[PDB]
Symmetry: C3
Subunit: 346 residues, 3 copies
C-alpha cells in the first residue's frame, strides 16, 4: 500500500531485558523494489534505563549514532588506548567499523534513546556485532577458538582462560552499573529556516568531515501545533525521516500519479525519495530527525511560500502557457502566501 512508511512495529527486537533494548529496522528494500538505493543502510534503535551499560563489542559496519534523548558516555577503544566522549541529546558521532566500544547511561532518572544509522560494506545490508563476553544468548567469540590456540595465544592453561574470560558472567548485553573525531550537535549552527511556525537545522557533508565520507546529511526539524512545512522536494538526497516527539501529518507525492499520506507517531519513520514533492503538518508540537543519503549537493526546491519558490521564477508568458489562469492570475496567487517554508496549517 504505502512503501515509504516504516511504523515502529516494523523494527525488530535484537535484544531486550529489564535494562534496555536493541531493535533493528527491517531492510529498506525488504518488500519493495522502490528503495534499492537504500539497500546498504540499516537503522537501529538503542534504549536503556539509568545507570546501565551496553557491553563492549565491535560492529562490522560504520555507524552513525545520534542521541535522541538523554545523555551517554561512549568509550572507543583502540589497540593503543581509548577515547571517552560524553554525549548529549542531539549529539552525533561516527563509530568506524571494527572499533570496539561500550555505552553508558549515567543518569539517575533519565532514559537513553539512541538512533544508530548503519552503513554496511562487507555484506551489503547486514550488520553484525561481535561481543566479547558470553551470555545466555551467545558465548564470547573468543570461545570459538581451539584450546590449543587459546592456550598458546594467552600463555596460560585453558583453565585460567575459561574462568577469567569465557565463562558466562552476565545474563544479557545490557547490564546494571554496579550499585556503587569529536561528536557534534545538530544545533551547533543557526537553523537554515527559522520563523514563528518552525525551525530546521541541517548539517551537510560540505560542512562536516565525518559526514563528508558518508555522503550523508543530517537535519533536526521542530514545528508548532498546526504549522505546515510547505510542498517542496529534495534534488539529490533521499531522506529517512524519524518521528522523535509529537505527531505529524505527512503528504508525499510520487510518480500513475500517487499520493501517500500518513500520520506519524513517535518512533515512526517515513522515507522521502529525492525529487518527490513532500509536505507535512504538525498535528501537535513536534521534533523530527532526518538522515539524508546521497547528500552531496542536495538542493531543496520550494513549491509554495514566498522565499525559494521555483514556481515564482517561471516567466509570465511561460506560466500562461503552463497553467490554466493567465500569467497575471498565477503570479498573483503565488503572492497570496506571505510566509516562507513554514506556514499556518489552520
Amino acid at each position: 500500500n504505502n512503501p515509504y512508511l516504516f511504523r515502529s512495529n516494523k523494527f525488530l527486537t535484537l535484544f531486550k531485558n529489564q535494562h534496555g533494548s536493541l531493535r533493528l529496522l527491517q531492510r529498506f528494500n525488504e518488500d519493495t523494489e522502490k528503495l534499492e538505493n537504500l539497500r546498504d543502510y540499516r537503522v537501529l534503535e538503542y534504549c536503556s534505563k539509568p545507570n546501565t551499560l551496553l557491553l563492549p563489542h565491535h560492529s562490522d559496519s560504520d555507524l552513525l549514532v545520534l542521541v535522541l534523548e538523554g545523555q551517554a558516555i561512549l568509550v572507543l577503544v583502540n589497540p593503543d588506548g581509548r577515547d571517552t566522549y560524553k554525549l548529549d541529546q542531539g549529539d552525533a558521532i561516527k563509530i568506524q567499523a571494527g572499533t570496539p566500544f561500550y555505552l553508558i547511561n549515567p543518569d539517575n532518572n533519565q532514559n537513553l534513546r539512541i538512533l544508530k544509522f548503519a552503513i554496511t560494506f562487507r555484506r551489503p545490508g547486514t550488520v553484525e556485532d561481535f561481543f566479547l563476553s558470553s551470555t545466555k544468548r551467545l558465548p564470547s567469540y573468543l570461545s570459538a577458538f581451539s584450546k590449543n590456540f587459546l592456550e598458546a595465544s594467552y600463555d596460560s592453561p585453558y583453565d585460567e582462560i575459561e574462568q577469567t574470560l569465557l565463562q558466562e558472567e552476565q545474563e544479557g548485553v545490557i547490564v546494571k552499573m554496579p550499585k556503587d573525531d569529536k561528536p557534534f550537535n545538530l544545533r551547533s549552527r543557526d537553523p537554515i529556516y527559522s520563523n514563528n511556525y518552525g525551525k530546521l537545522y541541517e548539517i551537510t557533508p560540505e560542512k562536516n568531515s565525518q559526514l563528508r565520507d558518508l555522503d550523508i546529511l543530517l537535519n533536526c526539524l521542530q514545528m508548532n501545533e498546526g504549522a505546515l512545512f510547505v510542498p517542496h522536494y529534495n534534488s539529490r538526497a533521499t531522506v529517512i525521516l524519524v518521528a522523535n516527539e509529537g505527531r505529524a501529518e505527512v503528504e508525499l507525492v510520487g510518480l500513475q500519479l500517487r499520493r501517500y499520506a500518513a500520520t506519524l507517531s513517535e518512533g515512526d519513520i517515513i522515507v522521502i525519495p529525492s525529487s518527490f514533492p513532500v509536505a507535512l503538518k504538525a498535528a501537535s508540537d513536534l521534533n523530527m530527525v532526518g538522515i539524508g543519503v546521497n547528500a552531496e549537493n542536495n538542493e531543496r526546491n520550494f513549491l509554495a511560500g514566498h522565499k525559494e519558490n521555483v514556481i515564482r521564477q517561471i516567466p509570465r508568458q511561460v506560466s500562461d502557457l503552463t497553467f490554466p489562469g493567465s500569467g497575471e492570475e498565477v503570479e498573483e496567487l503565488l503572492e497570496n502566501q506571505k510566509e516562507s517554508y513554514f506556514v499556518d496549517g489552520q
Copy 2:
C-alpha cells in the same frame, strides 16, 4: 542474436502529438546479461516542430542533453532565479537532477532533434519527470496535495487554486508557441583524428568539468562515403554509438569468438564494449555521436593503419613466434597501409 544493437524501433514513445515527441530507449540490459555495466543509464530522444514549447518539469535524474539538429532555447529555473541558454547543433549541456526546466524550438522552418542521456541514481535505470501542469494524460503533481494542504500553503481558497494552477489547460506537454555551467560544443577543439576520409572530435572528462563528474566522454564522428574506420578498440570506455546522419556498416568482434555486424540507419544505436575490437564503414556520408561511459583514462588502440598501431610495436622475434609469417613478412604487411585511422573502403 546481436545484443549490442538497438534499432530505432526499440525506442518507446512517452509522448507524441502534432508538435513533437518524446521517446525512451529500452533498458540496456533489458534482454541481455552482457550490458550490466550500463543499467544505470537511459537514452531519450526529443523531437519537436518549430515555434513549440516543452512544458516545465524536473527530472529525478541527471541529464546530459545534446542538440543533434536545429537550435533550442533552454531555460533552467532555480529557487532564486533563472538561466537561459541558446543551444546550437552540436551543443551539449548537463541538467542536474531536480532542476525544473523547459525547452523551446524558436525556428520557423527547422525541427529540433535532441538526445538526452540519463544518469539515474535514485532508482537505478528509471527516469521520472514531474510536470507542473495538468494535461489529458496526467494531472499536475500539485494536484495530489490535499485541499487543506494546498489552501494553507498558498493562502487562498481552494477555488482560486484549482482555477489558476490545477485545471487542465493544455492537451499535451509539447505546445505551440502562441502565434505572436555553460553549454559546450563537440567541435570546439580541433579533431583528434582528421584526414581526407574522416574526422573525429572527442571531449573527455579530463578536459571538461561537467563530463568529469559523470565519467563520460563524448565524441562526434564524420566519414565520407566509402571510407573505413580501421579495427581498433577502447581500453576502458564502453561506447554507445548513435547514428545521426547517413548509413554505417559496423563490424564488432567479441569473445566462442563472435562477429556482430550490422548496417546502422539514422536513429539506430550500437553499443561498443570496452576492449572489443571494432571497425566501421561509411556506406554513405555520415555523422555519428558517441557517448562513452567509464571514460576516465580511456585509450584507443589501433590494429591497422600506420599511426598508433599496437601490432606494429611487437618486436620481430615475438611477432615471428606470434604470427604465421616471418618477422620480416609481418612487419612489411603492416607497412602496406600508409594511412592511419580512416582509410579507403574501396
Copy 3:
C-alpha cells in the same frame, strides 16, 4: 560447509600444454551469498616451464600480477612504443585493462608461478583475454573481420593477410622460446611485525600509487614451524589469503556463532572477511600472500599478545562487568603472554 575456503582443486583450467598452464579460480560468490563484496574480483594463476613465452593478448580487466616463484620478463605494448620489465619473486605490477602484453620465463632451470588478481568493470566478475594469434583452440580475433574490411585496413590482398597474420602457426598460447609505472617488491620495506616466530610485510594504498586506485593492500607472511599468528581481525579489509609455501592451520570465527577451521596446503586459498577474528598456525615453515580488498584505512586489532591488544585497553571496572573473573584476574591473564603478534604454537 565452509564458504571461505577455496582449495586448489577449485581453480579451473583455461589452458594447459607441456609448457605451462593458466587456471581461473571459481567466482567468489559462486555458491555462497556471503562473498557478494568480492563479486568483481577474479584470481588467476599462471605457471610455465623455462624458456617459454605466453603470447601477446590484452585483457578487458585491470590486472595485478605477482611473481610467486621464479623470474619473468614482462612486456607492455602501447600504441607508440613498449615497456620491458624484469620481474623477480615477490615483484608486483598492475597491467591496465586493454594493454597488450606477453610474458617470458627466461630461466633455464626454474619454473614461473605468477598470481594474477583481476579487477573487472566491463562485466562484473568476468575476465576476457583477446589473443592476437590463432591456435587450435581459438582463431585470432583479427580473423573475424570481413575480407573486405581486412583488405582495406591493411591495404593488401586477402592472400597476404591470411598467410602472414591469421593462419594457425602455434598450437597453444604458451610456446617454447626458439632454441637459440614500475613494479614493486613486497619486501621493499621493513616488515610491520617481525620477531623470532614470524614476519609480516604489508603494502597499503596509502603508501603506493598503483594500489591507491585499486583500494587494495598486499601482504607477505612468513612463519616458522609451530609458530602462531594470534587472534586478531581486520577493521575494513576483506583478505584473500593464498598459501604459497608450507602448510597452515587456520581458525576463523564468524557470526549462530561459527568456527571455520582448515589446514591450507600450497595453492589453497582462504578468504578472511573484515571484522571476523582469525588466527593461524604454521604447521611447518610457511609463506603466504594476502590480497586485501576495501583496503583504505584498514586497521588490525589484536585480541591476545602484548602489543596492540584491544582487550588490554578495556578499563578494570568495565572488564569486571564484561568478563567472569575480576578486573585484576583478567588484567593479569592478559599479561601472561609476553610476546606480540607471533607466538609459540607448542
